[PDB]
């Protein structure tokens, strides 16, 4: 049937910073399974952040704390500020 994936959304990032670059099949699955794992670390730490503060709600604040825990040092400085651009751009729209 249908296997959902993140394979298509890699070519929309691979062709942003290296537009003359292909990527193999068996290397797609790593960047596929990199996403699904780094998804449920951030979600599965934001999930356990909901119980620790007695709320049933995953806000966009709780994903920010569950990225300042998993990412160390200098990735935790960029991937926070690479999200709050994509939210402030999002909320000024619609």
């Amino acid at each position: 049937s249908r296997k959902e994936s993140y394979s298509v959304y890699v070519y929309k990032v691979l062709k942003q910073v290296h537009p003359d670059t292909g990527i193999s099949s068996k290397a797609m699955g790593i960047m596929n399974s990199f996403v699904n794992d780094i998804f449920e670390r951030i979600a599965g730490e934001a999930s356990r952040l909901a119980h620790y503060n007695k709320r049933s709600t995953i806000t966009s604040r709780e994903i920010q704390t569950a990225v300042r825990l998993l990412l160390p040092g200098e990735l935790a400085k960029h991937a926070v500020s690479e999200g709050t651009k994509a939210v402030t751009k999002y909320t000024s729209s619609k």
């Binding site: 402030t88 751009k89 909320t91 000024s92 729209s93």
Partner: protein, 338 residues
């Protein structure tokens, strides 16, 4: 027993007056008329309606749910002040769509003219207001500042700054946004200027705030025919399309021309008082509206007695909590069947 031209009706005893009506009232909790036509199926006696009114004043399940069919009277147009920097009408707008980490915009309208002032903040705290006016008290000092009974203005901290400046704080009656007059109008101006600029782009409205207190402050009042700049200062600044009609005059003498410009302005018209108006009376029973009425709950509280009447629109009532809650007469209802 008695005979009527619609059939045979029954005269009940004098001991059976309160019982027979109360069992007909509580069948559908009606008022004066649908109560009465239930009794008009079995019974009849002289002065039916003197007993139905005797019921409803005790039935405190029906006084705190039915709303009044008696509107409040004519609205008051209070006069304009005679100088600027006398009444500021302040009210946060927002949460707007975000820009630069800003969501809330303090709006300080002068009550003299309409000259708006904008001071955007991150969150409507007490201290976000206090530094927002320290920019504006750098210009001049007001006598009175009106507002609404905000979360940030009613704080005991905000009043202690306000007594330093000589600010006479003035608060509206609660759940009455109509009391703050001009600021509720200019917030329909700011959201019709920033609406018109931001058509077809992301709402980056933190860029356009120096525009708004220069674009609205040079819009001619179309029923006063002046700029907010002229009624505040006296002459235009270097703006596009500025008057040269004042350059044929001396500034040392048109100061006292300006005081006669300010006292010839249009005053609004009071509407005619409609037929079903009602007036408060000191001693009359009144019922406030419940503040935030939850679902399937009384719209109104228990009755209360008017202590003092201040004008024909503002009345001090004595609530069930023991509260001297100075409410409007667009809050209250006349207590039914006194």
């Amino acid at each position: 027993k008695v005979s009527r031209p619609e059939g045979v009706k029954i005269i009940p005893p004098q001991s059976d007056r309160q019982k027979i009506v109360l069992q007909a009232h509580n069948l559908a909790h009606t008022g004066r008329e649908a109560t009465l036509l239930k009794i008009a199926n079995l019974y009849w006696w002289p002065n039916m309606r003197k007993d139905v009114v005797k019921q409803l004043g005790r039935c405190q399940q029906c006084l705190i749910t039915n709303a009044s069919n008696k509107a409040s009277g004519p609205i008051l147009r209070p006069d304009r002040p005679q100088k600027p920097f006398d009444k500021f009408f302040i009210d946060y707008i927002g949460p707007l769509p975000p820009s630069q980490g800003y969501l809330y915009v303090l709006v300080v309208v002068d009550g003299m003219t309409g000259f708006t002032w904008l001071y955007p903040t991150k969150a409507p705290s007490t201290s976000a207001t206090v530094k927002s006016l320290n920019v504006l008290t750098s210009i001049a000092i007001p006598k009175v500042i009106h507002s609404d009974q905000g979360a940030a203005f009613t704080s005991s901290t905000f009043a202690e700054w306000a007594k330093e400046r000589g600010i006479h704080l003035e608060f509206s009656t609660p759940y009455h946004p109509q009391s703050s007059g001009k600021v509720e109008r200019k917030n329909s101006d700011i959201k019709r200027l920033l609406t018109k600029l931001l058509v077809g782009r992301p709402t980056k409205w933190y860029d356009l705030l120096p525009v708004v207190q220069l674009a609205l402050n040079n819009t001619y009042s179309p029923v006063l025919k002046y700029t907010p700049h002229q009624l505040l200062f006296g002459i235009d600044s270097n703006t596009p399309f500025a008057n040269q009609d004042t350059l044929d005059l001396t500034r040392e003498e048109e100061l006292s021309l300006l005081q006669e410009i300010r006292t010839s302005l249009y005053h609004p018209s009071t509407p005619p008082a409609s037929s079903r108006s009602w007036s408060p009376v000191v001693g009359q029973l009144v019922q406030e509206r419940v503040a935030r009425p939850a679902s399937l709950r009384p719209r109104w509280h228990k009755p209360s007695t008017v202590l003092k009447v201040l004008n024909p629109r503002t009345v001090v009532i004595l609530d069930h909590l023991g509260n001297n809650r100075t409410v409007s007469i667009d809050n209250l209802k006349p207590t039914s069947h006194q």
